[PDB]
């Protein structure tokens, strides 16, 4: 067992090594594949991003100044990387260093101090008292000095105007300006015709200035926009008035220019020519007042000297420069605010007019969002207590509403300032909050009393490695490309070893399939294990899977190799071809791997039971293992031994076992075309008996085989010599019989019997890529010989073969057929086998190699029990020693040759070469004589039987010159006798005949290639049902802003400063019966979301044993209240950070709020740290369970705490100081007061929102607005039915968006066109494989012999292909028109597409014609043609994703590209017409336009034309004195030496075409047609009549026989039946001369004689025939004028007997008498030329050369010695033609 496996592995390794054409590519393909993989990996480095927070944004309701400050500077998500103070629950500032807020505070302080100051009245009273020393004068002067000091202090202690002046003088290199603006505004980290061109050029410079152009995108819809609303309902009018007021709150700069123009002269004269200023300047400079000013200044800067220099200046810095600078600043701000539109309110009567006006303003590039209410009627009723409003804006400023989530999860906070922040800079949230606050003010009455802020939740320290995620999850593709190459190669090898009948030869040699399968398993693992190790080390070195142990991936790759090896072992027993299996294995594996990519997309509702029942394949299990590896690798921890993967390995081993048992079942239930599905002479006892059969029988004989005699075994192959030879071997078991093979029964022991019993079947065994020496060594080792024994056997075989040279012993299987047959028959004798069973030797070999192999078998007659089994008669006569013929399953005759010849055989045959005189002489000499056969210059007679021989020969020799007899001959009876005794309009006729034959071969192909009609049909059906799934990608439905759009979410409410000031009732109403928003309140006004009613429990989740360590780790202050969580250590790439438990610190009290969600109280806890820790730990815990983790929390609220005095002060100040009622003084003061009282906020709420949710911030804003509404409602019946709902619905698409969606949709069109191209490329494949099947000498050349006009044949093929493609064309047309695809089923697009498909077929059917010319193999062009068609289609599709003009002009040669471009332009025009009809216009451009579609049609037409012309062109491509005369009825057989060019001469020698018939050596008949139809079609093409066709067919079917099987498939016939069909074809037209070639090839007796009778009958009618073959018996029995050509020239000509007597050898004699040496001595002394050819017991034979003329004396001596030598039997024969042939070939 072990030595056999050793020989098997050695043979497999030698096969793998001797190729040198497959293993190098096998080992190089994975290198290139993974090199491309490592290159595309190294091109994408991993992106690392530290954890960061985001500043809080301010809404317009929380103050105009903070809103503007949040818009301008901090609107880019700077990611400070540290917790900003804005995220603190107490402070809502972050504008502490902003000089604008400081300046506003100092201005407010100046106002509130000047209103309560009385320095003006005090100074006026002091001046009046001084103008009208004293006692009260001192007190008055002291009061005036104190008042002046207070005014000086008020002018000081502000430090804002100085900084503003410094900044405005510095502003009037790129980083410096940005830093200056950032320090000024906030803290530290065609248009010219509309309005004036000043701010137009300003905004142009802003857009062209080199900085972050994001603030302009937010400031454009702020002062250029315009909002429009519903009809003029009084309530809508009131809310619009409130919105206008909250906009104009910032209009204090509009009426400031008039105030400055009115107040400039007054302050000018007050500072120039006022007595108060002079008195102040005089009192500021004195001898005692200086100390007072120094004491009042408190050591501050700008002492009294600087004050006197600044104020007291009649003519370096005085008040004049300050006045000029303030005037310039006011002028600049007025010119800036001039073109600012603050009246952006326009009412509309209806809704369609609203849409039209919004579009019109969109063309004007000035249009903000628009509010659309849902009023029931324009009545005086305020509100229906439920406000439903929508906000319609442009699509480029609002997030898409067709999707609410990114779909696949991916790390990243999603905080881009422009790409995914349209709800901030677009103005959606601002206007939404403004409208909501206006509604709150108009419903209840409260004005604001509320601030709102938005805070984005931070992200916990991720890294961006999406490439690793997409590569490690798509590992099997590039992991198994090279392994698909390997499995294809190994499948090719296996099926090649199987098809050559090598497995059957190994089985009959005494081997089982188990050891063969095991050896193939090992020889397929070894290279697979090597490649697995190489891929493991190249993946460990590639740095793409770090921290991964090589052992686990190595064992995974090895078990995957094992399961794939057993999978291909299962798949191999289904195919029966080398290239076919090698090509279809890859596509079958792809189709069975496609389930993986099919199931990975629908993982949402996949079950574990479904996963188990679907994991029966190896690719899906490998994909599950790769997903496990990815999930354990992405987190940086890697995969190690930690006890999923084990389930995947278990399923893989179960799959291996299932594949093994399936292989074991299929190898037995369905085998190939060769497997098995589950007058007796004296017995010479001089030698030993080797095999003695006894009672041989089967399911519906006894012969004793001898040792030293070469016995024969003849039969009809139907009743014997076929089942008996199989029962004698180990193929089939016996049935009530016995066979003692060398003293061992067959049924008793079968192993020891096969150890010394060789076999040699008809199919020779010769492994390729190997030498004959390796073959001999392997066979000797398999026999069981030792090393020296095998060497001696190989030396003996090399010495006895005849090729003892290194040129032949070290060469591969490149010898001729004769040498191959000789070596294959010599292999069966290696090993010293005592019993050999040959099978059909010398089938079609030349007579020289036949004599060689005969001498070879004769040299091995030293007791080897040679059992011959062949159909040849002369071979069995010369080789067989004991001829045994059986019939009907029983023994009939047995005995030697001469015994069977003289017992029941016919008498002698006397022939004469060149008739009544000779016949009369023969009748007078012998009474029993008769005339047997007389042919051209030849006659023969029979002598059935003895002194008449001498007298007859004397009379023949004496009267030889009397008649025309030129030479005589005598012969004995051959074994075949005993065998048979015992057991013009012709063009149209050819056209219609071709069409009829083609229709018959196509209609009878229901079981054959019939899939070429329904396979493209189902492919196009799948194409359409897949195209009816992708959304139009151009829809935007109306979505209601509500936070419950997601499945599950976690909210929270953080109550800061619980002092019951204004925050208690707010959170209360937030957590009352109505809940968060409008989910359920006296009904469910939200579709498909019924809320749960019964739930009320304030409990804490069960905490594990983690609070103990928190207790022993006490002193957890507000700063750092939880243990740290590390990040991205060196050389450790971690996607999500991990750290020990205790991340949150304490489980907050969880409670459900009856809205399908649960909230937790976070009062007094660090919000940012807790949120980060909880989020990261929950994401990790959810990802650990293989759930495809989604988002966890979306939003939460934090309530906290942050007037009329300033308004009363402004009113009191405006009442005095020259009050008036003009529109330039009172309006400015009123606006200033309103802006002052519109910035204070009592309480505020901060909404923490996650930017991953597309509609999260707006929904929570609406929720908090509804909560504020329910809290502000007082003295109401119930807050249930008081709620506000917000909607989001963009406007209609314009021409730009329509063009965008028409240009972007080309992806679905190209992907639906590629597949339909692939489906339509299947029709010509059947035509090409049909032409290939009938191209290899089957029907092309045979029809080309006779007059066929091959151009007409090509025309017929073309028209049949057209009419056979018409049917599937309209079939698929009605298929894809049955569906409602308006882009194809319209009345103007159906005929153009139909004709496009028609011309595409017309242009593709000739293109695949020349690919069939040079292709010498059938049933394999299908896959390569489909592959090249797919490649051409892919190239043409990708070539349209771009120099484009010349590209599309030159790429029109491929019809696939033309069809793709036509479909693309057709669907593009359909979409364009649809968009233009939707917009309100019409276009009727015809698709038949020569520029668009119609150039491709004419191109395909002319291309098909030129392809047909060039295919007709390719077909046309633009011996030594051979002299012989063939008269009427002269069978002139022209034989020749091996390699004399007989086929070339026959092709060269072939009016003359129609008068000549040809018979091919190989079978030429259709596999699916009928023989009668074959002969009918051939009679039609021959030129017979249309009415006499049936009679000619019946005559042809009755002449050649086989009438019982005349109506049947020709492919299901046998070899002899095919030969009969071919020789009937050779006479279908009835030519005067017909050329035959090997009429009998592997046939059986009782049928060759029939063909010979038909041949002699057709040549007897005066029609000469020409034939040639290797078997000399056929020509010696049929040919009458032989023509032997040695080298190019006819070396011998004449009759058969004349040539055999002229250059042939002498006669042969056989005498039968233990024995006596005296008889042999007398025989040797009587003839001088006597030679002992063979010496046996009581049977001698001799040969007499150069003694043919003395036959009479020889017969006389024989008759005289019959009584002296006591001879029992005598026989005399002549030399046959084979001796003459081998003599002519020997001396050559
Ligand atoms: C909730 O929990 C988070 C953490 O989980 C807390 O955040 C901690 O507290 C501060 C933020 O609120 C952070 O302090 C900052 O730390 C920066 C780090 O710089 C180094 O710090 C180490 C000490 O860790 C020093 O030895 C080094 O020398 C560095 O200074 C400081 O740079 C930063 O200092 C600021 O610098 C800017 C720019 O120069 C100044 O303008 C500013 O005035 C200030 O000086 C500041 O000290 C702290 O790192 C952060 N994390 C930790 C682990 O403590 C929240 O505070 C918690 N919430 C509440 C309400 O407390
Ligand atoms: C809405 O507000 C705008 C300004 O915020 C008002 O327009 C003012 O009044 C007339 C136009 O109506 C102009 O002459 C003024 O220059 C505008 N600006 C100012 C500051 O007065 C408009 O009147 C308001 N409309 C309603 C219905 O209140
Ligand atoms: C209510 C508040 C927030 C609005 C007023 C903010 C003021 C102080 C800011 C906002 C816009 C700023 C102006 C923007 C444009 C220009 C034009 C430039 O050539 C000179 C500076 C100047 C004139 C800036 C001066 C300061 C400015 C007017
Ligand atoms: C600046 O921050 C300090 C911190 O204590 C605070 O007291 C002060 O009011 C802030 N200034 C503002 C908000 O203008
Ligand atoms: C906008 O699109 C809707 C969608 O059907 C349509 O009903 C409406 O008429 C369109 N309006 C305009 C002005 O095109």
Automatic annotation (TrEMBL):
Domain ABC transporter: from-to ranges: 691-913, 1519-1712
Origin superkingdom: Eukaryota
Residue ranges crossing the lipid bilayer per the database entry: 23-44, 475-495, 515-539, 551-571, 578-598, 1009-1030, 1310-1332, 1352-1378, 1390-1409, 1421-1442, 1497-1518
Membrane topology label: Multi-pass membrane protein
Keywords: ATP-binding, Disulfide bond, Glycoprotein, Membrane, Nucleotide-binding, Phosphoprotein, Translocase, Transmembrane, Transmembrane helix
Family, similarity comment: Belongs to the ABC transporter superfamily. ABCA family.
Protein name: P-type phospholipid transporter
Gene field: ABCA1
């Amino acid at each position: 067992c072990w030595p056999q496996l050793r020989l098997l592995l050695w043979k497999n390794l030698t096969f793998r090594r001797r190729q040198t054409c497959q293993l190098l590519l096998e080992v190089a393909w994975p290198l290139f594949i993974f090199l491309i993989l490592i290159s595309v990996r190294l091109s994408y480095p991993p992106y690392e991003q530290h954890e960061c927070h985001f500043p809080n944004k301010a809404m317009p309701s929380a103050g105009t100044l903070p809103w503007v400050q949040g818009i301008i500077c901090n609107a880019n998500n700077p990611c400070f990387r540290y917790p900003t103070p804005g995220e603190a629950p107490g402070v809502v500032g972050n504008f502490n260093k902003s000089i604008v807020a400081r300046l506003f505070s100092d201005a407010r302080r100046l106002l509130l101090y000047s209103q309560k100051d009385t320095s003006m009245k005090d100074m006026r009273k002091v001046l009046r008292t001084l103008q009208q020393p004293s006692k009260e004068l001192a007190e008055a002067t002291k009061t005036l000095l104190h008042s002046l000091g207070t005014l000086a202090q008020e002018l000081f202690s502000m430090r804002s105007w100085s900084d503003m002046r410094q900044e405005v003088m510095f502003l009037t290199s790129s980083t410096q300006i940005y830093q200056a603006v950032s320090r000024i505004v906030c803290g530290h980290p065609f248009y010219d015709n509309s309005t004036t061109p000043y701010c137009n050029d300003l905004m142009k410079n802003l857009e062209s200035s080199p900085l972050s152009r994001i603030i302009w995108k937010a400031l454009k819809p702020l002062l250029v926009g315009k909002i429009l609303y519903t009809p003029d309902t009084p309530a809508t009018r009131q809310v619009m008035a409130e919105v206008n007021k909250t906009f104009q709150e910032l209009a204090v700069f509009h009426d400031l220019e008039g105030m400055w123009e009115e107040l400039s002269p007054k302050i000018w004269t007050f500072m120039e020519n006022s007595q108060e200023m002079d008195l102040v300047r005089m009192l500021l400079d004195s001898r005692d007042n200086d100390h007072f000013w120094e004491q009042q200044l408190d050591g501050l800067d700008w002492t009294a000297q600087d004050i006197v220099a600044f104020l007291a200046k009649h003519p370096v810095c005085t008040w004049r420069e300050a006045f000029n600078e303030t005037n310039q600043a006011i002028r600049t701000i007025s010119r800036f605010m001039e073109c600012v539109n603050l009246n952006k309110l326009e009412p509309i009567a209806t809704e369609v007019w609203l849409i039209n006006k919004s579009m019109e303003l969109l063309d004007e590039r000035k249009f903000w969002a628009g509010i659309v209410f849902t009023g029931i009627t324009p009545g005086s009723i305020e509100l229906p207590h439920h406000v439903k409003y929508k906000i319609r804006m442009d699509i480029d400023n609002v997030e898409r509403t067709n999707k609410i989530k990114d779909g696949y999860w991916d790390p990243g906070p999603r905080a881009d300032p422009f790409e995914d922040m349209r709800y901030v800079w677009g103005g959606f949230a601002y206007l939404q909050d403004v409208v909501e606050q206006a509604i709150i003010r108009v419903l209840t009455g409260t004005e604001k009393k509320t601030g709102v802020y938005m805070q984005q939740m931070p992200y916990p320290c991720y890294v961006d490695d999406i490439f690793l995620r997409v590569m490690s999850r798509s590992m099997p593709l590039f992991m198994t490309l090279a392994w698909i190459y390997s499995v294809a190669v190994i499948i090719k090898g296996i099926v090649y070893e199987k098809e050559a009948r090598l497995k059957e030869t190994m089985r009959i040699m005494g081997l089982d399939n188990s050891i063969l399968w095991f050896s193939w398993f090992i020889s397929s693992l070894i290279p697979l294990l090597v490649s697995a190790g190489l891929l493991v080390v190249i993946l460990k070195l590639g740095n793409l899977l770090p921290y991964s142990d090589p052992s686990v991936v190595f064992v995974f790759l090895s078990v995957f190799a094992v399961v794939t090896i057993l999978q291909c072992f299962l798949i191999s027993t289904l195919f029966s071809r080398a290239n076919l299996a090698a090509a279809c294995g890859g596509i079958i594996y792809f189709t069975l791997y496609l389930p993986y990519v099919l199931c990975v997309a629908w993982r949402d509702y996949v079950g574990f039971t479904l996963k188990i029942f679907a994991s029966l394949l190896s690719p899906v299990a490998f994909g599950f293992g790769c997903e496990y590896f990815a999930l354990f690798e992405e987190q940086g921890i890697g995969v190690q031994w930690d006890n999923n993967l084990t389930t995947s390995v278990s399923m893989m081993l179960f799959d291996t076992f299932l594949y093994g048992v399936m292989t074991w079942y299929i190898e037995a239930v369905f085998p190939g075309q060769y497997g098995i599905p589950r007058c007796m002479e004296e017995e010479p006892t001089h030698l030993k008996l080797g095999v003695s059969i006894q009672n041989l029988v089967k399911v519906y004989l006894a012969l004793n085989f001898y040792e030293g005699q070469i016995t024969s075994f003849l039969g009809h192959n139907g009743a014997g010599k076929t089942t008996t030879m199989s029962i004698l071997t180990g193929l089939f078991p016996p049935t009530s019989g016995t066979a003692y093979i060398l003293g061992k029964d067959i049924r008793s022991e079968m192993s020891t019997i096969r150890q010394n019993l060789g076999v040699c079947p008809q199919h020779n065994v010769l492994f390729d890529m190997l030498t004959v020496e390796e073959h001999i060594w392997f066979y000797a080792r398999l026999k069981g010989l030792s090393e020296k024994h095998v060497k001696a056997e190989m030396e003996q075989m090399a010495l006895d073969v005849g090729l003892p040279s290194s040129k032949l012993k070290s060469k591969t299987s490149q010898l001729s057929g004769g040498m191959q047959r000789k070596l294959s028959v010599a292999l069966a004798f290696v090993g010293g086998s005592k019993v050999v069973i040959l099978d059909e030797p010398t089938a079609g070999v030349d007579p020289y190699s036949r004599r060689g192999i005969w001498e070879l078998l004769l040299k091995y007659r030293q007791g080897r029990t040679i059992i011959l089994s062949t159909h040849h008669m002369d071979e069995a006569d010369v080789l067989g020693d004991r001829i045994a013929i059986i019939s009907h399953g029983k023994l009939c005759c047995v005995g030697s040759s001469l015994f069977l010849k003289n017992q029941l055989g016919t008498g002698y045959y006397l022939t004469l070469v060149k008739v009544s005189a000779i016949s009369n002489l023969i009748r007078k000499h012998v009474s029993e004589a008769r005339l047997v056969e007389d042919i051209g210059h030849e006659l023969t007679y029979v002598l059935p039987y003895e002194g008449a021989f001498v007298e007859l020969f004397h009379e023949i020799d004496d009267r030889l010159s009397d008649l025309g007899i030129s030479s005589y001959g005598i012969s004995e009876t051959t074994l075949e006798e005993i065998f048979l005794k015992v057991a013009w309009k012709l063009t149209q006729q050819q056209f219609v005949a071709l069409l009829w034959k083609r229709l018959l071969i196509a209609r009878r192909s229901r079981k054959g290639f019939f899939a070429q009609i329904v396979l493209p049909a189902v492919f196009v059906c799948i194409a359409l049902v897949f195209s009816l799934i992708v959304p139009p990608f151009g829809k935007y439905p109306s979505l209601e802003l509500q936070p419950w759009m997601y499945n599950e979410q976690y909210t929270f409410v953080s109550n800061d400063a619980p002092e019951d000031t204004g925050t208690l009732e707010l959170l209360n109403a937030l957590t009352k019966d109505p809940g968060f928003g409008t989910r359920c309140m006296e009904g469910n006004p939200i579709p498909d979301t019924p809320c749960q009613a019964g739930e009320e429990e304030w409990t804490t989740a069960p905490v594990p044993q983690t609070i103990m360590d928190l207790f022993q780790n006490g002193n957890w202050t507000m700063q750092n209240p939880s243990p740290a969580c590390q990040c991205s250590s060196d050389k450790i790439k971690k996607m999500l950070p991990v750290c020990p438990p205790g991340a949150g610190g304490l489980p907050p009290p969880q409670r459900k709020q009856n809205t399908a969600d649960i909230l937790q109280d976070l009062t007094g806890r660090n919000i940012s740290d807790y949120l980060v820790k909880t989020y990261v730990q929950i994401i990790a815990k959810s990802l650990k369970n293989k759930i495809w983790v989604n988002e966890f929390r979306y939003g939460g609220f934090s309530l906290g705490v942050s007037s009329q005095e300033v308004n009363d002060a402004i009113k009191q100040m405006k009442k005095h100081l020259k009050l008036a009622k003009d529109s330039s003084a009172d309006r400015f003061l009123n606006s200033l007061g309103r802006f002052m009282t519109g910035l204070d906020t009592k309480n505020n709420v901060k909404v923490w929102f996650n930017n991953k949710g597309w509609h999260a911030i707006s929904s929570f804003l609406n929720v908090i607005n509804n909560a504020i509404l329910r809290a502000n409602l007082q003295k109401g019946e119930n807050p249930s039915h008081y709620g506000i709902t917000a909607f989001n619905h963009p406007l209609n698409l314009t021409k730009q968006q329509l063009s965008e969606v028409a240009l972007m949709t080309t992806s679905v069109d190209v992907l639906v066109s590629i597949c339909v191209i692939f489906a339509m490329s299947f029709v010509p494949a059947s035509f090409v494989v049909f032409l290939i099947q009938e191209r290899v000498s089957k029907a092309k050349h045979l029809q080309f012999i006779s007059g066929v006009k091959p151009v007409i044949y090509w025309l017929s093929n073309f028209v049949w292909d057209m009419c056979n493609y018409v049917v599937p064309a309209t079939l698929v047309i009605i298929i894809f028109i049955c569906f409602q695809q308006k882009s194809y089923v319209s009345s103007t697009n159906l005929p153009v597409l139909a004709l496009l498909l028609l011309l595409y077929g017309w242009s593709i059917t000739p293109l695949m014609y020349p690919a069939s010319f040079v292709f010498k193999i059938p049933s394999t062009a299908y896959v390569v043609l489909t592959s090249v068609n797919l490649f051409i289609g892919i190239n043409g599709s990708v070539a349209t994703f771009v120099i484009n003009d010349i590209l599309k002009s030159v790429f029109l040669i491929f019809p696939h590209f033309c069809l793709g471009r036509g479909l693309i332009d057709m669907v593009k025009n359909q979409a364009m017409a649809d968009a233009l009809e939707r917009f309100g216009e019409n276009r009727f451009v015809s698709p038949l336009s020569w520029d668009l579609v119609g150039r491709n049609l004419f191109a395909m037409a002319v291309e098909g034309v030129v392809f047909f012309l060039i295919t007709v062109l390719i077909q046309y491509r633009f011996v030594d004195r051979i002299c012989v005369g063939i008269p009427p009825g002269e069978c002139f057989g022209l034989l020749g030496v091996n390699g004399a060019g007989k086929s070339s001469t026959f092709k060269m020698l072939t009016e003359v075409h129609q008068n000549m018939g040809y018979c091919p050596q190989f079978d030429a008949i259709t596999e699916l047609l009928t023989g009668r139809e074959h002969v009918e079609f051939f009679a039609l093409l021959r030129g017979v009549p249309e009415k006499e066709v049936g009679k000619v067919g019946e005559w042809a079917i009755r002449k050649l026989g086989l009438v019982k099987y005349g109506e049947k498939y020709a492919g299901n016939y046998s070899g002899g039946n095919k030969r009969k069909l071919s020789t009937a074809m050779a006479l279908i037209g009835g030519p005067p001369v017909v050329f035959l070639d090997e009429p009998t090839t592997g046939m059986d007796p009782k049928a060759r004689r029939f063909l010979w009778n038909c041949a002699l009958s057709v040549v007897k009618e005066g029609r000469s025939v020409v034939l040639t073959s290797h078997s000399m018996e056929e020509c010696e029995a049929l040919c009458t004028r032989m023509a032997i050509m040695v080298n190019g020239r006819f070396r011998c000509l004449g009759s058969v007997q004349h040539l055999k007597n002229r250059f042939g050898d002498g006669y042969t004699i056989v005498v039968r008498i233990p024995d006596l040496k005296p008889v042999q001595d007398f025989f040797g002394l009587a003839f001088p030329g006597s030679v002992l050819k063979e010496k046996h017991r009581n049977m001698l034979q001799y040969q007499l050369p150069s003694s043919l003329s003395s036959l009479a004396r020889i017969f006389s001596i024989l008759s005289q010695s019959k009584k002296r030598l006591h001879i029992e039997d005598y026989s005399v024969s002549q030399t046959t033609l084979d001796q003459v042939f081998v003599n002519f070939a020997k001396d050559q």
